[PDB]
Amino acid sequence: VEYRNWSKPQCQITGFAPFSKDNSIRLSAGGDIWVTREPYVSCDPVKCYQFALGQGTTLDNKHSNDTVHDRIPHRTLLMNELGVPFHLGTRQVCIAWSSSSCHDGKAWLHVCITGDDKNATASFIYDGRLVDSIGSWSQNILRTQESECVCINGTCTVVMTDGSASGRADTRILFIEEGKIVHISPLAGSAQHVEECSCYPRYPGVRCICRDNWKGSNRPVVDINMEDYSIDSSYVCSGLVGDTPRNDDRSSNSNCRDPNNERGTQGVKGWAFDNGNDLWMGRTISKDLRSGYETFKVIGGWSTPNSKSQINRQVIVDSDNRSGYSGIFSVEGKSCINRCFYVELIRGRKQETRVWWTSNSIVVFCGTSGTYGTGSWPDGANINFMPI
Amino acid sequence: VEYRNWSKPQCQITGFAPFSKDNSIRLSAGGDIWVTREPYVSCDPVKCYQFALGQGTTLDNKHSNDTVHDRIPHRTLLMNELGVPFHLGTRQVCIAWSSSSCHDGKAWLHVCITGDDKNATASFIYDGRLVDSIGSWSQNILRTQESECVCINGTCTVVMTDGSASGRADTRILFIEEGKIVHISPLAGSAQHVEECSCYPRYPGVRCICRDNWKGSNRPVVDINMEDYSIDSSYVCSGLVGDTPRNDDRSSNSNCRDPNNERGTQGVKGWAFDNGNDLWMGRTISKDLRSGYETFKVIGGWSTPNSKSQINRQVIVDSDNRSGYSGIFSVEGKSCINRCFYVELIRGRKQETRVWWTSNSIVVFCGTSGTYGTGSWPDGANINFMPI
Amino acid sequence: VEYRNWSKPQCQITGFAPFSKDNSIRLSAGGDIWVTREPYVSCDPVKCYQFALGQGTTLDNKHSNDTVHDRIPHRTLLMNELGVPFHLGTRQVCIAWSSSSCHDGKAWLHVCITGDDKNATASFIYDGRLVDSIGSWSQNILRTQESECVCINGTCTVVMTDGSASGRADTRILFIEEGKIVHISPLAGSAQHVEECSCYPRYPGVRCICRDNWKGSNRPVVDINMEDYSIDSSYVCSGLVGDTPRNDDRSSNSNCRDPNNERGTQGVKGWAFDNGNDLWMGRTISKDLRSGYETFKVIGGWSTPNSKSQINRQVIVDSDNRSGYSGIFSVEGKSCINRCFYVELIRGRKQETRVWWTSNSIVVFCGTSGTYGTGSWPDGANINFMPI
Amino acid sequence: VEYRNWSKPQCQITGFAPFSKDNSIRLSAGGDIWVTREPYVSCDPVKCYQFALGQGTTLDNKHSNDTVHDRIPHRTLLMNELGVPFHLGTRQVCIAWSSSSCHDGKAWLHVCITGDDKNATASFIYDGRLVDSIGSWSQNILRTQESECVCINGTCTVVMTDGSASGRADTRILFIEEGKIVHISPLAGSAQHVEECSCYPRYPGVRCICRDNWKGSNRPVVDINMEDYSIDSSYVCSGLVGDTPRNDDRSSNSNCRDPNNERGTQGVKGWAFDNGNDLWMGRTISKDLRSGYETFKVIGGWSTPNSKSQINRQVIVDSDNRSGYSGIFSVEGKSCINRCFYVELIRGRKQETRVWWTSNSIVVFCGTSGTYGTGSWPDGANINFMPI
């Protein structure tokens, strides 16, 4: 095998086409399925897999009660083929309550994180074996992307932050070759809070769109340079804006430089990705909760501040159904490289209260240069049928 | 690997021999099994698989209730090895409430269809990745074969129709190379309604036998020419006739040209396939409902209109057991290429009412140039034992 | 790959060593497991598998009730790796209520039999595809070995009989190359009833020890000559005798030529195999029922009639636990070829009556030229814990 | 492939990083999972597996009651990929109530032991087939390591003992090449009881740290010489000491030569491993029961008697949670070979009494030359939620 350099143009995409649904919440009411969250999907050169941090339990289990917590000693990274739900035959690739994974073209690499919030460690496992690790540098919930990392020429760059959720933090960009941390560069530029980045290649670099959980409603952009470990950060120009809580279509702004300070605190993992001076983006249709999910292209949203002229919108999940996190993922074609995205349809505690567990299921679309139609592909689980 | 051209004579078949049964409805009363329908089987060069559109649920699940619907956002295409039932480890290859699959000799290709009836999209997934897509052209339930598509020299031809179930429609024949739609030809000839074709190679072409859900009791024939995308359509000559509702053996006709207008409206997917001027065919023994299933050769049924002299009949399912859809599938031998067929034994709502779910199981026979006996291989599930 | 000729001496074996147990009946009371019977084990060149005709159902299923029948349309041949029990992920290789399987060194071959007793067909499936078939020649339960067939230089010889269980029958020896019946030779010699042979190679031939269900307590020997399809049949010399019902140690005889007429009617599949003029053999310790199972070498039992001087006995299953069928199976070593055997530990209806189902589990030993100890490895399932 | 010689320096390790957790006890309350104990983990050249002697049953099974016994005819060696729990699809590699496994670089080798305590046999299975066996030499519970054996240049050396648990015994060191016992050397040196050794390579030799169940609180060291089958035995120098019952930190000693006679009787499998004159070691934090588990380096603990100056301690399991057995396991890197360890978190009967079963789950760490943090990764199963 050869390492992937991802060099070949991004494919011109008309919009997205349905690609895979898993129905985990539906089946759980008739089969032992894992209780998960913060899922993501990524692919080796031959096929795609689906990851998700489980809750060290199945759904029809007493231990499911109160899984409305992001951090416990039992969350491990699950990894199945795209399409096969997380049943009991599913493998727990490592102990992790925060992860990332990518395949350098030769082998997989997972960065799994567990430990006390105050002093967690992050194991760098490469090709089966545990190759390196690192401890918390700011002693405050060392966390990573929660989606696919990216590698070019044998070097995978994952980004991680440690510090305050709603205040200054410490974002570092890691360069790991074959499981070994060959370099660490610190965040630079104008971004004011970087949590869980959705990253993709843009030869010869990697580009991220993340979550400002402190003062931003607009999304931080984080540009990595693999040539010299340089970093730069900004915000997306679109006045449309894709974080939740969001402000409002008429009343939302972004100058491409600073956290718009409009309902900035709190967030949700999401993604976006350029195209010329355009921006393909996605977001929960709601600006208060995570419900429904539409996507659209913002003409001039990658280069002109406060641009709000959209075209090509699509409803993936209807406005009155639950949405959640979401992230990009690239797949390579015979001629270019398409961008795809998944969306975590979360169920259970918080909104729903008939139950005490919290899990989710997924749905995944992929860019297409062709024609497509209309639909809404929600979780589809009658909450009254469900256990607990 | 090399692409398949399927060139080598059709094997002379004496009748069919049993090949695989799955017992899904039986096991479901003692194990988490999927709720499926519209199944089909097809094979890569080394082994055969079994497909079926699931109902985004298992049978002993509350979500099973009311799965007497062909279209919901949760139907995804399931794919297992021939013989292994659709258990929870089963992979959902894509979101689809109407599909087709074939393997060009190098990789699999699935055409999965979901969306609103009024505006559905059809994703063309090839070798793991989503390579193309298309939207509904007549805005009325864009649907496809529901059985194996066929490829020769790297080009797979799937046929699809969109329009009225019981009235004029819009049938198009798609030519896709490596997931890419390289051409679309429209239906031509005398056929008056083409739904869910059962197709097979006949180097250098592909031949289909489908369902006329409007004015035909006789079956439409659809002949594709891969050399120049030309199309032709007719009807099977046999006065025997294989659609249901069917007329009656004494009172059924077909001139090989026009929908016999005998109880034409409604139908069921089925198959048939020539041999010289003969026709190997199959059908539910009932002409009112889908019950029992016999097969036979109609001497002169491929060339002489209203020919009803049969020979070699076989009962696969006895007259007083449930039948359903059915389709062909070719497998290549050391010297020729055999034709096989499956039969969807459907259970649950509509006929049976003790329950609220609807699923099925399969059974599959294969042409044999040898000797064989007698039997009936029905679903075999005591409906009173079954959940709900 | 190359076809196997099995040429290399039989290994000198001191006795048997434990090789694999599956615990199916135990687990069934805490997990969806198949209801099977007439199991057997065999191996491709890299690893061993376990086969068994299921009963188209799992054990904790209402459909399990009354599975005390050898013939129904739903029995299919199950095939797992040696050690993994028949769970729902298990593949049903074909429809069969009587089978055999062997691997010519290049691919597997299964001969599966189903149909009406009066007119059954036997499908010859080779390397995934259905290559041939045959109908019942005597119209009375066409049945086969129920254990591994053997191939040398690409030719697999399976034996089959059709006729009366307790009266004259019609035994034929089949020669199949790559799924194709290249020749049929009829039984010859002095054997008077041949049912379910346990066969093994003895380059350049194949040798069988079977069941005389009519007039024999002693076992028929069936010698196949691959060089010219010649056949010969006799009986084992040992006055010890290994069929059940058996007579008694003091009062049992065999002249190596004719069915000893001592409690001949009825039987059970078993095995034995020579070594010089010696005979390694196995049998239920009981001569009335199938209970317990011991093995021993009979010095001079392969060449001298009514020889009863044994040595090396071993208890595999203690006298007061259930036994059942059993058969040989050869595995090739770096220098010779060892013989192994399995034993069907059957539970449920007939003897046990707390339940209505009937299934079994297995245990398998293998010849060893080394030291060994003592034990008894019964099913071990508290019948009162078990469902139904 | 080539046989492994393991030649390349031991990696300098800063401490351990989390590597894999399985959550078996948690899931068992919501899914059919095996009842196991005495687990271990080991790896072929591409990936790691997890082994464990099951109890011929699943946890939510009546047959689980009273599995507080180390020896019954149904314990078989289970083998899954590291991370996938022992579900019903799990393979039982052989019948065994005491085992060991290693992969010579070309194929796996398992030494499985079952039989009467008084006269057990030990099957040596190599590469699928049963290659050799041996009987009990002292007629008193022939038992082996219960963790990974090690091979260099095609020769695997497993050690086994037979005799009195709390009195003189008979320890033998076995040299097996490709499943064949090519030599047996007897224990030599000053060790006074060797049970269940944790062994690892130290080219050109193998080194073991075991359990003195008779007069030692300190651990026996067993040094094997592959060059000439020579053996030597001693005790670890650290005055810290790692057996349980242990004495006390202030009041515990070891002169590197003789069983310290401090609470020597009884024990638990554990491990340790040098580094210069240092000793990386692990142990239940309790010295009375198996609870909690910490690890630390004892400066000068490999060369100076009664050395108790520790550094780098880590809590893997907190003091008030259940611990159990534990063992080493080596994995090879691009430059050196890291040492890892697992820890059996046991639940059920003895301590816990709400239930009648006894099983466990695991957690596994691996040496790291990098940074790490803090945590405790216990079983995490609410015993009141659990079945029985």
Ligand SMILES: *[C@@H]1O[C@H](CO[C@H]2O[C@@H](C)[C@@H](O)[C@@H](O)[C@@H]2O)[C@@H](O[C@@H]2O[C@H](CO)[C@@H](O[C@@H]3O[C@H](CO)[C@@H](O)[C@H](O)[C@@H]3O)[C@H](O)[C@H]2NC(C)=O)[C@H](O)[C@H]1NC(C)=O
């Ligand atoms: C799900 O979770 C909660 C809390 O669960 C944890 O409980 C502790 C003890 C530990 O075992 C841990 O493993 C569990 O995960 C459970 O909540 C309790 O439910 C009862 C419901 O009646 C509440 O009783 C209260 O008192 C009287 C009646 O007794 C009423 O007047 C009150 O209105 C109220 O109902 C109790 O307060 C709950 N406790 C808490 C902290 O909320 C819950 O039952 C558990 N079970 C399920 C099925 O989800």
Ligand SMILES: *[C@@H]1O[C@H](CO[C@H]2O[C@@H](C)[C@@H](O)[C@@H](O)[C@@H]2O)[C@@H](O[C@@H]2O[C@H](CO)[C@@H](O[C@@H]3O[C@H](CO)[C@@H](O)[C@H](O)[C@@H]3O)[C@H](O)[C@H]2NC(C)=O)[C@H](O)[C@H]1NC(C)=O
């Ligand atoms: C299976 O399906 C139907 C409808 O299911 C859907 O129900 C809605 C509310 C939603 O939650 C969706 O997720 C479900 O899938 C259920 O049918 C109802 O069954 C009761 C049976 O007694 C009917 O009650 C009626 O009223 C009185 C008694 O109350 C009698 O005199 C009447 O004769 C009659 O029984 C009720 O009409 C049903 N509703 C409909 C629309 O038919 C069904 O219960 C459900 N359950 C199962 C096990 O299949």
Ligand SMILES: *[C@@H]1O[C@H](CO[C@H]2O[C@@H](C)[C@@H](O)[C@@H](O)[C@@H]2O)[C@@H](O[C@@H]2O[C@H](CO)[C@@H](O[C@@H]3O[C@H](CO)[C@@H](O)[C@H](O)[C@@H]3O)[C@H](O)[C@H]2NC(C)=O)[C@H](O)[C@H]1NC(C)=O
């Ligand atoms: C297991 O099998 C038998 C027969 O099963 C088949 O039944 C037919 C109807 C069909 O549905 C098929 O799918 C089944 O597999 C069942 O046997 C019956 O059990 C009851 C037990 O009380 C018997 O009742 C009798 O009558 C009175 C009490 O009603 C008593 O005085 C008698 O002594 C006797 O108990 C009945 O005769 C049984 N029928 C037969 C033919 O034996 C069985 O119940 C079924 N169930 C289970 C759990 O195994």
Ligand SMILES: *[C@@H]1O[C@H](CO[C@H]2O[C@@H](C)[C@@H](O)[C@@H](O)[C@@H]2O)[C@@H](O[C@@H]2O[C@H](CO)[C@@H](O[C@@H]3O[C@H](CO)[C@@H](O)[C@H](O)[C@@H]3O)[C@H](O)[C@H]2NC(C)=O)[C@H](O)[C@H]1NC(C)=O
């Ligand atoms: C788990 O195990 C024990 C023993 O199990 C074995 O039992 C034998 C018969 C066999 O079938 C084998 O397969 C089993 O594995 C069971 O212990 C019994 O439990 C009852 C509880 O009430 C005890 O009754 C006693 O008598 C009176 C009430 O009857 C009271 O005053 C006493 O205090 C006491 O409770 C009985 O002694 C137990 N027997 C023993 C030897 O301890 C246990 O029930 C079983 N079940 C479960 C769920 O774990």
Ligand SMILES: *[C@@H]1O[C@H](CO)[C@@H](O[C@@H]2O[C@H](CO)[C@@H](O)[C@H](O)[C@H]2NC(C)=O)[C@H](O)[C@H]1NC(C)=O
């Ligand atoms: C990724 O690797 C390739 C190696 O082939 C790099 O490209 C070559 O590297 C040097 C730098 O100019 C020269 O040997 C070749 O002219 C380069 N070009 C090609 C087409 O190989 C490539 O630049 C690397 N990418 C990064 C971002 O470092």
Ligand SMILES: *[C@@H]1O[C@H](CO)[C@@H](O[C@@H]2O[C@H](CO)[C@@H](O)[C@H](O)[C@H]2NC(C)=O)[C@H](O)[C@H]1NC(C)=O
């Ligand atoms: C269809 O594919 C097969 C396999 O590639 C081709 O087989 C060749 O057949 C030609 C004559 O048609 C012979 O000259 C070659 O020796 C065969 N090659 C192989 C690999 O068997 C076949 O050519 C193709 N069919 C056609 C009509 O071109």
Ligand SMILES: *[C@@H]1O[C@H](CO)[C@@H](O[C@@H]2O[C@H](CO)[C@@H](O)[C@H](O)[C@H]2NC(C)=O)[C@H](O)[C@H]1NC(C)=O
């Ligand atoms: C499928 O592919 C084969 C390629 O080998 C086609 O046959 C060859 O193609 C041209 C057309 O005459 C010439 O190179 C050879 O003489 C052809 N014959 C053979 C045997 O290869 C074959 O016709 C193609 N089939 C179709 C339907 O296009």
Ligand SMILES: *[C@@H]1O[C@H](CO)[C@@H](O[C@@H]2O[C@H](CO)[C@@H](O)[C@H](O)[C@H]2NC(C)=O)[C@H](O)[C@H]1NC(C)=O
């Ligand atoms: C049976 O198969 C084996 C493997 O193909 C054959 O092994 C050869 O044996 C001959 C002598 O019989 C030697 O000359 C070769 O060096 C061996 N080849 C291999 C691959 O090991 C063996 O020939 C076959 N047996 C017979 C009797 O022909």
Ligand SMILES: *[C@@H]1O[C@H](CO)[C@@H](O[C@@H]2O[C@H](CO)[C@@H](O)[C@H](O)[C@H]2NC(C)=O)[C@H](O)[C@H]1NC(C)=O
């Ligand atoms: C199985 O195949 C081998 C082929 O190698 C047969 O042996 C050879 O076949 C002929 C017959 O004498 C000659 O080419 C060689 O001298 C044979 N010997 C060897 C060692 O190859 C072998 O006899 C075949 N076995 C049977 C039973 O037909």
Ligand SMILES: *[C@@H]1O[C@H](CO)[C@@H](O[C@@H]2O[C@H](CO)[C@@H](O)[C@H](O)[C@H]2NC(C)=O)[C@H](O)[C@H]1NC(C)=O
């Ligand atoms: C152990 O195995 C490795 C792999 O086979 C051997 O690696 C070779 O090492 C020698 C020096 O020891 C070099 O000359 C070769 O270039 C290496 N070969 C490979 C494949 O890497 C190593 O020789 C073996 N160790 C010893 C001590 O012999």
Ligand SMILES: *[C@@H]1O[C@H](CO)[C@@H](O[C@@H]2O[C@H](CO)[C@@H](O)[C@H](O)[C@H]2NC(C)=O)[C@H](O)[C@H]1NC(C)=O
């Ligand atoms: C393991 O195998 C290697 C084989 O390469 C042994 O090393 C070689 O063996 C002899 C002994 O000196 C000579 O052929 C080479 O000089 C050795 N050195 C190397 C680097 O290959 C090695 O010693 C073996 N190890 C043991 C413990 O026997």
Ligand SMILES: CC(=O)N[C@H]1[C@H]([C@H](O)[C@H](O)CO)OC(C(=O)O)=C[C@@H]1O
């Ligand atoms: C490492 C971690 O805890 N991630 C969690 C994230 C985090 O709390 C936030 O980033 C504040 O910094 O919030 C949420 C959430 O409910 O959406 C889930 C994540 O698991």
Ligand SMILES: CC(=O)N[C@H]1[C@H]([C@H](O)[C@H](O)CO)OC(C(=O)O)=C[C@@H]1O
């Ligand atoms: C795409 C689709 O809906 N196919 C459905 C088919 C369809 O309704 C008919 O072709 C009218 O055009 O009918 C049936 C049916 O009950 O046999 C099932 C199919 O799922």
Ligand SMILES: CC(=O)N[C@H]1[C@H]([C@H](O)[C@H](O)CO)OC(C(=O)O)=C[C@@H]1O
């Ligand atoms: C094909 C078939 O029915 N085989 C059956 C065998 C048969 O009845 C006998 O060989 C009479 O000829 O008997 C038994 C039996 O209870 O041991 C089980 C077998 O399934």
Ligand SMILES: CC(=O)N[C@H]1[C@H]([C@H](O)[C@H](O)CO)OC(C(=O)O)=C[C@@H]1O
């Ligand atoms: C072969 C065997 O029985 N091993 C057992 C071991 C043994 O009893 C001791 O070594 C005395 O010699 O004790 C324990 C134990 O409770 O920790 C479990 C082991 O299964």
Ligand SMILES: [Ca+2]
């Ligand atoms: Ca925000």
